[PDB]
Short mmCIF file of N, CA, C and O in Angstrom, two decimals:
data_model
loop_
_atom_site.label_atom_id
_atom_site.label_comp_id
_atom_site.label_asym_id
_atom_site.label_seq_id
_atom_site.Cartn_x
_atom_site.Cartn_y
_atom_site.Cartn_z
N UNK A 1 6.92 -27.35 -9.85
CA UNK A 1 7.14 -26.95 -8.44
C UNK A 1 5.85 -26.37 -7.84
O UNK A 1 5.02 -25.94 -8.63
N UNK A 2 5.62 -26.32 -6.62
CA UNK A 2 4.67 -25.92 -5.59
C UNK A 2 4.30 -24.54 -5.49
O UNK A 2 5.26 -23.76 -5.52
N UNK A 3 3.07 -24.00 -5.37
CA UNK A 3 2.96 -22.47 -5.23
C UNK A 3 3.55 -21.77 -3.72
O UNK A 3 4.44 -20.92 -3.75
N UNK A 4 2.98 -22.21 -2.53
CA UNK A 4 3.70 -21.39 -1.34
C UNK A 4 3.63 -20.17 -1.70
O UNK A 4 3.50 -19.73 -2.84
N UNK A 5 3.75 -19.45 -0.41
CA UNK A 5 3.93 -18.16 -0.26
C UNK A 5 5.58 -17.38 -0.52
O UNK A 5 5.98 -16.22 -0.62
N UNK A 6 6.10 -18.54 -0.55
CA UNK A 6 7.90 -18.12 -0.57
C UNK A 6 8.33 -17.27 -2.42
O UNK A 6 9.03 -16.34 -2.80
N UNK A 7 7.30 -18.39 -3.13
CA UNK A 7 6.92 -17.88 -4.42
C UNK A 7 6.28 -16.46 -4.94
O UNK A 7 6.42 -15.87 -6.01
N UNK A 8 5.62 -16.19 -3.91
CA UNK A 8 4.91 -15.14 -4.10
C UNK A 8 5.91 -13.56 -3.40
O UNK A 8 5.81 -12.35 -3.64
N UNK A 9 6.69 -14.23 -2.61
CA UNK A 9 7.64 -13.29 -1.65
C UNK A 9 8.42 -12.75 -3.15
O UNK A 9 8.53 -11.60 -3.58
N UNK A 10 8.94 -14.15 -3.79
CA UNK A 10 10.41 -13.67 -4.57
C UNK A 10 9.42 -12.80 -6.04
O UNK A 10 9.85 -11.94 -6.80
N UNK A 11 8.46 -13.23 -6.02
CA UNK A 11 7.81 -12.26 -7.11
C UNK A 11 8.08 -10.77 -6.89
O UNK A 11 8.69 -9.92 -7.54
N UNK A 12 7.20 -10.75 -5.40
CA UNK A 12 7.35 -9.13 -5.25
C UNK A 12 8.56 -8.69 -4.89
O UNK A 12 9.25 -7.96 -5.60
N UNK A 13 8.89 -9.14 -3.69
CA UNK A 13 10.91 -8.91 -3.48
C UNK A 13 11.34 -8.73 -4.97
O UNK A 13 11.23 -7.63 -5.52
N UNK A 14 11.75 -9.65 -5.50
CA UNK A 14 12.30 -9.51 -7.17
C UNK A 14 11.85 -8.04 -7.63
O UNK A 14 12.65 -7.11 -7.75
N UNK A 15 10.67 -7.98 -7.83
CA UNK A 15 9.84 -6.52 -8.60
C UNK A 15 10.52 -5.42 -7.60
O UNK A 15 10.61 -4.23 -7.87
N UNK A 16 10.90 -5.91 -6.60
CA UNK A 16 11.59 -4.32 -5.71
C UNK A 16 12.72 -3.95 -5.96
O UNK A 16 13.09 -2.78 -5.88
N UNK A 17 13.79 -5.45 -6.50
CA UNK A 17 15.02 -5.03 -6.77
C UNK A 17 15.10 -4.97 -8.16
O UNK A 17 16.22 -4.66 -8.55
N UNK A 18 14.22 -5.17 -9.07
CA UNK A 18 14.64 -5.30 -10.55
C UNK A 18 13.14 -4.54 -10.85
O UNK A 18 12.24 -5.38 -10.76
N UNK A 19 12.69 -3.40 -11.14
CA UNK A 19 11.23 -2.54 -11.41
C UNK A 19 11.65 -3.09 -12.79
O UNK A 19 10.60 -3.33 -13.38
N UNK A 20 12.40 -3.31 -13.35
CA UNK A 20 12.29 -3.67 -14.99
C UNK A 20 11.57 -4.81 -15.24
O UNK A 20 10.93 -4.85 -16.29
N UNK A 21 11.53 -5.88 -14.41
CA UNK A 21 11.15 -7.49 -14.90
C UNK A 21 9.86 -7.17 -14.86
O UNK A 21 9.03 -8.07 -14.88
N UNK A 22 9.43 -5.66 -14.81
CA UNK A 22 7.50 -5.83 -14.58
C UNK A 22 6.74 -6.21 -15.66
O UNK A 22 5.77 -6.87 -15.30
N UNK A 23 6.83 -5.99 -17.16
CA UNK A 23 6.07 -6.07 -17.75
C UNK A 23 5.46 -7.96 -17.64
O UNK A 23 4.40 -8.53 -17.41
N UNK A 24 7.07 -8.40 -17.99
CA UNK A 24 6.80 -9.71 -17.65
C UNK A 24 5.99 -10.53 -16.74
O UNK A 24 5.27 -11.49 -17.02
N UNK A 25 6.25 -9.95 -15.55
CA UNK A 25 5.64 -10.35 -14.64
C UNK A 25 4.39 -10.09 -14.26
O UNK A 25 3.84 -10.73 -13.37
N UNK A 26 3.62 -8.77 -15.15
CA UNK A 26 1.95 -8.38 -15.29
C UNK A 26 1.71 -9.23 -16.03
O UNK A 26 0.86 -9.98 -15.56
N UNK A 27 2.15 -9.59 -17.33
CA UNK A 27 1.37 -10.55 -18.56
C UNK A 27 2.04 -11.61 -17.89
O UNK A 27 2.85 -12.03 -18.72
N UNK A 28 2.15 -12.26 -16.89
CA UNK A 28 1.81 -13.48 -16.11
C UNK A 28 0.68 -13.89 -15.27
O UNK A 28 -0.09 -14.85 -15.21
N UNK A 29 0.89 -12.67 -14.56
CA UNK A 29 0.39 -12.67 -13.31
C UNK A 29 -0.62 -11.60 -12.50
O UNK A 29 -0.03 -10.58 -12.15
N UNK A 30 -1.67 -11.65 -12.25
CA UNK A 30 -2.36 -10.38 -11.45
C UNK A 30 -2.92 -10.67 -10.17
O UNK A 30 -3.09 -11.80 -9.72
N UNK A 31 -3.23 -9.44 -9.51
CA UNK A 31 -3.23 -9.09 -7.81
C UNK A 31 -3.98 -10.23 -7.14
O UNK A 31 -3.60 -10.82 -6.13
N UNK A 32 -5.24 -10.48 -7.89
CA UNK A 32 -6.49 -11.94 -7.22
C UNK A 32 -5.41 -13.28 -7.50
O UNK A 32 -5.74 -14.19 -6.74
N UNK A 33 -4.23 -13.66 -8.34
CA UNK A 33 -3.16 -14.71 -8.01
C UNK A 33 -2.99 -14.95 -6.52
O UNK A 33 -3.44 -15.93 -5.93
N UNK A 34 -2.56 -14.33 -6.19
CA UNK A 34 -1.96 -14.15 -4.66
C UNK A 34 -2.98 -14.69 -3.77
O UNK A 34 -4.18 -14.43 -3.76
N UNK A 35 -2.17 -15.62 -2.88
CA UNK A 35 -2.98 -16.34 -1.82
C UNK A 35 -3.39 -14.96 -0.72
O UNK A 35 -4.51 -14.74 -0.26
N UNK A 36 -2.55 -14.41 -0.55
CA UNK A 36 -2.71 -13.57 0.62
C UNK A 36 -3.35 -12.08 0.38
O UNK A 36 -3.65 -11.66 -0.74
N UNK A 37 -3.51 -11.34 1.59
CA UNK A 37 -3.78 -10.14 1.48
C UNK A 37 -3.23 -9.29 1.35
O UNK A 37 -3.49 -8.48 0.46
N UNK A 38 -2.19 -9.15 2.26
CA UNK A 38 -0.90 -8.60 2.18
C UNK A 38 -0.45 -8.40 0.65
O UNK A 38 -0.50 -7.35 0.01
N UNK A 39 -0.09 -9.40 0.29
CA UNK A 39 0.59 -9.59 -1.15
C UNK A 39 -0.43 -8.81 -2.40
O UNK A 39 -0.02 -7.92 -3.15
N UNK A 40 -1.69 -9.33 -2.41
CA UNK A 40 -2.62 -8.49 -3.45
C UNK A 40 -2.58 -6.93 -3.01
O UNK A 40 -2.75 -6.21 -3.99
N UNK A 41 -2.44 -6.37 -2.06
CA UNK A 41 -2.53 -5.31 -1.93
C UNK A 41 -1.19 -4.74 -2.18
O UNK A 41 -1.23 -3.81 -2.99
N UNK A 42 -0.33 -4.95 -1.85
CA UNK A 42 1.22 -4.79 -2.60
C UNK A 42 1.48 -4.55 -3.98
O UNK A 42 2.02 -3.56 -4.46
N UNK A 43 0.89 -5.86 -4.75
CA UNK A 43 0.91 -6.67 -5.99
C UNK A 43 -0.27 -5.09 -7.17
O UNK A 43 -0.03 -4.64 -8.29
N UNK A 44 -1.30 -4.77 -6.26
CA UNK A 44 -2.20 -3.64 -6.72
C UNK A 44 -1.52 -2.48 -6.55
O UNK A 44 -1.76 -1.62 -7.39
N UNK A 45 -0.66 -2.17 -5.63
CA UNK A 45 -0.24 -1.06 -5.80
C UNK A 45 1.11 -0.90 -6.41
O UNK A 45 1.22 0.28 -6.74
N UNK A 46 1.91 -1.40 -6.63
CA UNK A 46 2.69 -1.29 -7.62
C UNK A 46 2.54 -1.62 -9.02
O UNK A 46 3.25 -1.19 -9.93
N UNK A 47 1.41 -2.53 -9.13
CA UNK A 47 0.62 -1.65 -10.44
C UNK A 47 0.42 -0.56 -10.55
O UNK A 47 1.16 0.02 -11.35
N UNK A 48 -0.67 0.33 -9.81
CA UNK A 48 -0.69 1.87 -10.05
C UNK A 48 0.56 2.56 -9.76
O UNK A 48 0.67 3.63 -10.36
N UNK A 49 1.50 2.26 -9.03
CA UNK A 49 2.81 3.21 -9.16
C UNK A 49 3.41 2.67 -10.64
O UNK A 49 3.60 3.66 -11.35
N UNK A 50 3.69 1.67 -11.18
CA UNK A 50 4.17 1.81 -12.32
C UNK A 50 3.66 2.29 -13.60
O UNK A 50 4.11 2.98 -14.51
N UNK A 51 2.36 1.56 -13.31
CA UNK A 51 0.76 2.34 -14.38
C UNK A 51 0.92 4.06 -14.75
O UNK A 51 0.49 4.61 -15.77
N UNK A 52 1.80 4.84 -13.38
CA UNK A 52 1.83 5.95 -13.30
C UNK A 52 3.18 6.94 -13.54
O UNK A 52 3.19 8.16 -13.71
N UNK A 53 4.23 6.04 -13.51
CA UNK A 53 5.88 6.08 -13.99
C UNK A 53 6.30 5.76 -12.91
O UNK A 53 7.24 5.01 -13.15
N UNK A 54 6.18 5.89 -11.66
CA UNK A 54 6.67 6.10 -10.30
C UNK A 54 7.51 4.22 -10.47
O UNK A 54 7.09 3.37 -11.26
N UNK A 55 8.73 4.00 -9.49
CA UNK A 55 9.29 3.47 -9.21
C UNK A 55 9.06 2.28 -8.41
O UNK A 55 8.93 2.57 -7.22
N UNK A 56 8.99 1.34 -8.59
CA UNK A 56 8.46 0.44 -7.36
C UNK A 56 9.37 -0.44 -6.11
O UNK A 56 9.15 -1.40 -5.37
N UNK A 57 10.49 0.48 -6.38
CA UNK A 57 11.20 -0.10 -5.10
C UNK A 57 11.08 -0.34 -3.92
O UNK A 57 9.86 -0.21 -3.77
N UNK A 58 11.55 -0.63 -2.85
CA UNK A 58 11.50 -0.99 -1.41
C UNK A 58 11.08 0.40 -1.30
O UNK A 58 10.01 0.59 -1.88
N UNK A 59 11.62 1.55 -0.69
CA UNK A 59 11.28 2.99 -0.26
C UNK A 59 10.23 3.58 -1.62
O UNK A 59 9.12 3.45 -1.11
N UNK A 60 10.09 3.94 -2.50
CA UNK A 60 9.44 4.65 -3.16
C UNK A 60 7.50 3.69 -2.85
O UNK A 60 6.43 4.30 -2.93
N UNK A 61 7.63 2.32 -2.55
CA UNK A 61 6.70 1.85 -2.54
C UNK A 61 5.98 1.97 -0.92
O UNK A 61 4.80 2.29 -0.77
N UNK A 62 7.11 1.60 0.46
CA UNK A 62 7.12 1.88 1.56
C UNK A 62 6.56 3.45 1.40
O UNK A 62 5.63 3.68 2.18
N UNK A 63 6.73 3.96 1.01
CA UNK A 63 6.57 5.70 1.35
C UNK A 63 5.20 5.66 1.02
O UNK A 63 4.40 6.00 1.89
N UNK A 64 4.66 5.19 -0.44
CA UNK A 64 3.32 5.60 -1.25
C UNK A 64 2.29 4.86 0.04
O UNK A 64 1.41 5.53 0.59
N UNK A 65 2.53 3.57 0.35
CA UNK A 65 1.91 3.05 1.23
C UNK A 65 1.16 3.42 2.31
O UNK A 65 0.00 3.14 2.61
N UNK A 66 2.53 4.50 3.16
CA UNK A 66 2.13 5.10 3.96
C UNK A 66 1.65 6.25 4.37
O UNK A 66 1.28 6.68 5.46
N UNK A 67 1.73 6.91 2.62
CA UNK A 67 1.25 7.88 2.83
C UNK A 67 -0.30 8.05 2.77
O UNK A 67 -0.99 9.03 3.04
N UNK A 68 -0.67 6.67 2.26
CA UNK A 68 -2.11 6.30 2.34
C UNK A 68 -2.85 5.54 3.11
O UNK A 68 -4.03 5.23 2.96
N UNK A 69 -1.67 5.08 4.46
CA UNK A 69 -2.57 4.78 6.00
C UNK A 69 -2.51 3.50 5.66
O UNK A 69 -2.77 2.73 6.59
N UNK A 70 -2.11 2.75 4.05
CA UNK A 70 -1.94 1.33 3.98
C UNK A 70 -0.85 0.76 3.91
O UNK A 70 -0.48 0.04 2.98
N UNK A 71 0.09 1.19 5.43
CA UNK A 71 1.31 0.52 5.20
C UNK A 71 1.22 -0.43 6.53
O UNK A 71 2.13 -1.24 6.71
N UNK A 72 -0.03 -0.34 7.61
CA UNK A 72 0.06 -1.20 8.57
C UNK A 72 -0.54 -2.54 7.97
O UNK A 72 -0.23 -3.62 8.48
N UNK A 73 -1.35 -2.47 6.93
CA UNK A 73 -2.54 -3.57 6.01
C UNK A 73 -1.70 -4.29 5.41
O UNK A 73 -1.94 -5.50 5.38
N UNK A 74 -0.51 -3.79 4.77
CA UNK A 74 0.47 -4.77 3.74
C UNK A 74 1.18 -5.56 4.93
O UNK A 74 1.43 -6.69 4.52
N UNK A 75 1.69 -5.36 6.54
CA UNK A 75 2.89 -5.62 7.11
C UNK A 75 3.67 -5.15 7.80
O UNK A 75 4.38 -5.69 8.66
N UNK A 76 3.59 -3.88 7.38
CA UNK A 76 4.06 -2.17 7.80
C UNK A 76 5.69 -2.58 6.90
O UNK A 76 5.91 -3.51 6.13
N UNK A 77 6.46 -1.66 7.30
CA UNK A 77 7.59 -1.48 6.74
C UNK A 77 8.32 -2.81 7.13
O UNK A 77 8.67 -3.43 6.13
N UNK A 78 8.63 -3.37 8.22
CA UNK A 78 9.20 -4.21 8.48
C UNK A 78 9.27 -5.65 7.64
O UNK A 78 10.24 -6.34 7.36
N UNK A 79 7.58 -5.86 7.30
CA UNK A 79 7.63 -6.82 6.27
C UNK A 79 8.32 -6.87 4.91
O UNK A 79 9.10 -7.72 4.50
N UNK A 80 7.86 -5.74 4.29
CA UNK A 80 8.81 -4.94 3.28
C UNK A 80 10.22 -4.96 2.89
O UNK A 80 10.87 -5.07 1.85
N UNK A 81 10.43 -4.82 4.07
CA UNK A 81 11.68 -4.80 3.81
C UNK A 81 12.51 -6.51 4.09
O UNK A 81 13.66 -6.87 3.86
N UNK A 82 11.63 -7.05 4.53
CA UNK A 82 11.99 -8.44 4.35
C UNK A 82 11.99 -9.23 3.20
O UNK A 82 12.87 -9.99 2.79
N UNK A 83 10.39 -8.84 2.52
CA UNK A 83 10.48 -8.82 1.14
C UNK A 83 12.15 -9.08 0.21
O UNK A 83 12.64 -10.05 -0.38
N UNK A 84 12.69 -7.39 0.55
CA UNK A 84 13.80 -6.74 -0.34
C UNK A 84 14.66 -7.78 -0.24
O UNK A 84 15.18 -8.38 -1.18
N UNK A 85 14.85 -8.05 1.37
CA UNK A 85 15.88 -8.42 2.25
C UNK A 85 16.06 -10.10 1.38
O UNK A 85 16.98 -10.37 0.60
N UNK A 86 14.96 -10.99 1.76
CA UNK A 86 14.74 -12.35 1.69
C UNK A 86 15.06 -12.79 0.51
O UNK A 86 15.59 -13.90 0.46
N UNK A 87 14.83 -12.04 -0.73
CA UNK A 87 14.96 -12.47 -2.27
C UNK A 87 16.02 -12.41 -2.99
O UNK A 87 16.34 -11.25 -3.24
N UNK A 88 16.66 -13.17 -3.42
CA UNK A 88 17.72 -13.28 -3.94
C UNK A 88 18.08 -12.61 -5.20
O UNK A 88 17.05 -12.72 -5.87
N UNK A 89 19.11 -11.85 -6.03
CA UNK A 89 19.06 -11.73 -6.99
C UNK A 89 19.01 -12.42 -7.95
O UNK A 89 18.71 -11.93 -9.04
N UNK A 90 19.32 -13.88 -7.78
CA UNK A 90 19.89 -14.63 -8.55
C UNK A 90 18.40 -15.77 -9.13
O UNK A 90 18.26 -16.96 -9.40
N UNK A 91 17.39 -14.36 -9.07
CA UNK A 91 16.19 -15.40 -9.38
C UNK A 91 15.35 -15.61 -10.60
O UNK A 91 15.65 -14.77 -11.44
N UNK A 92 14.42 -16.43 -11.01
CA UNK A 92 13.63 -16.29 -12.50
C UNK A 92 12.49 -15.28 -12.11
O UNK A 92 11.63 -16.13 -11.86
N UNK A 93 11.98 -14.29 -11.92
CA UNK A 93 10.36 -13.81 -11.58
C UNK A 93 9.55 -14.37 -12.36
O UNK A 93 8.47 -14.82 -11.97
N UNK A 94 9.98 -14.43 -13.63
CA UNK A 94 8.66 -15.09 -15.13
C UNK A 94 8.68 -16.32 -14.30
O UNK A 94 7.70 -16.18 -13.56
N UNK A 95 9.34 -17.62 -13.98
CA UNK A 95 8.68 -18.81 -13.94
C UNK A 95 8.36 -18.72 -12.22
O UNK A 95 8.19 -19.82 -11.69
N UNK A 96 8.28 -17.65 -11.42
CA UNK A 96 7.91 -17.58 -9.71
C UNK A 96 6.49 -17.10 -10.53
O UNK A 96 5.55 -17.90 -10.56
N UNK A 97 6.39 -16.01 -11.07
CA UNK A 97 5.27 -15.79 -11.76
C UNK A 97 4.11 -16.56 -12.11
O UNK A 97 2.94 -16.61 -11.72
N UNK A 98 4.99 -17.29 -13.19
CA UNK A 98 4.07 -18.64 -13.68
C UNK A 98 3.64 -19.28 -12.33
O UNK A 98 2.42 -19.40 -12.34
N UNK A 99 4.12 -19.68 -11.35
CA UNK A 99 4.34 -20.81 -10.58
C UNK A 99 3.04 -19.96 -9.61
O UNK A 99 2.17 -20.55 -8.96
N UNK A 100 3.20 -18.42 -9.74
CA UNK A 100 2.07 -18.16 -8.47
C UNK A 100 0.26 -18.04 -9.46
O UNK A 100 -0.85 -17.97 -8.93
N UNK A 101 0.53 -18.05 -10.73
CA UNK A 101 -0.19 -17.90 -11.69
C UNK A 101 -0.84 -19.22 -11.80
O UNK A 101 -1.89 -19.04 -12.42
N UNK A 102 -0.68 -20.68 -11.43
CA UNK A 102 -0.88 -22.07 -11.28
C UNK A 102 -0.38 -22.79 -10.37
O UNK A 102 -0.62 -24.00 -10.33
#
């Protein structure tokens, strides 16, 4: 299957509703993968929130964002939460992973 950006949505969406699928999805995949800007900067910071214990959900990630003036750079909240919104539960992250990884 095709890389797209829709791939790269359900990666991070996914990582917002499931913070568990992360390990998997680091030993796939890292922040320079990502076509976009938006997304690597997302993709980097929920590395360091998990790197650090912190949570990487929709709000715990929305909040860190903004509390660092980089929540208009990702999308602002609105994107974010489309992210959450757009991604299905019912998804693989390891092979969206793979797929944004090649």
């Amino acid at each position: 299957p095709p890389h797209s950006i829709e791939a790269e949505q359900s990666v991070l969406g996914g990582l917002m509703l499931d913070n568990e699928r992360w390990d998997d999805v680091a030993e796939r995949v890292v922040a320079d993968d990502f076509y976009t800007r938006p997304h690597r900067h997302i993709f980097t910071e929920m590395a360091r929130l998990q790197e650090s214990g912190s949570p990487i959900d929709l709000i715990t990630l929305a909040e860190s964002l903004e509390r660092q003036g980089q929540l208009d750079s990702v999308g602002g909240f609105a994107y974010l939460a489309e992210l959450s919104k757009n991604t299905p539960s019912a998804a693989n992250i390891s092979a969206y992973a793979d797929i944004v990884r090649e």
